[PDB]
Design a protein around this ligand. Structure first.
Ligand SMILES: O=C(N[C@@H](COP(=O)([O-])[O-])Cc1ccccc1)c1cc2ccccc2s1
Length: 113
């Protein structure tokens, strides 16, 4: 396992998220179910080729990394929430995760380095 991996991600927050608000929406009102249904909509569209991961990220991600097209930059273990961390180091360079849950919300992760 490298010391650090670089990843990009798309985050869909929901009304039960740790901090239910984001740069794009003053208050996150969508339910947990609606958030996972969105994440899965984005996953099937990225797999079909209909949408690009980084464009959907820059547009709909509730994480401020949206401005950097989803890029979180590099990180070692013991920094990010453990579900996110495990899923990221498990990814090959260029591989996309399926739904990933953390207190912040639901994630789709793309390992770049
Ligand atoms: O932590 C982050 N943004 C969290 C917001 O969520 P909130 O605290 O408002 O619940 C969501 C998140 C959770 C887990 C892994 C990665 C991201 C980070 C945002 C950025 C932006 C640029 C570079 C590094 C980072 S690191």
């Amino acid at each position: 396992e490298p010391a650090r991996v670089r990843c990009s991600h798309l985050l869909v927050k929901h009304s039960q998220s740790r901090r239910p608000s984001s740069w794009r929406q003053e208050q996150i009102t969508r339910t947990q179910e609606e958030a996972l249904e969105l994440i899965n909509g984005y996953i099937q569209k990225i797999k079909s080729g209909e949408e690009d991961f980084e464009s959907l990220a820059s547009q709909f991600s509730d994480c401020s990394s949206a401005k950097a097209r989803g890029d979180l930059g590099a990180f070692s273990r013991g920094q990010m929430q453990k579900p996110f961390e495990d899923a990221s180091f498990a990814l090959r360079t260029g591989e996309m995760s399926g739904p990933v849950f953390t207190d912040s919300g639901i994630h789709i992760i793309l390992r770049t380095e």
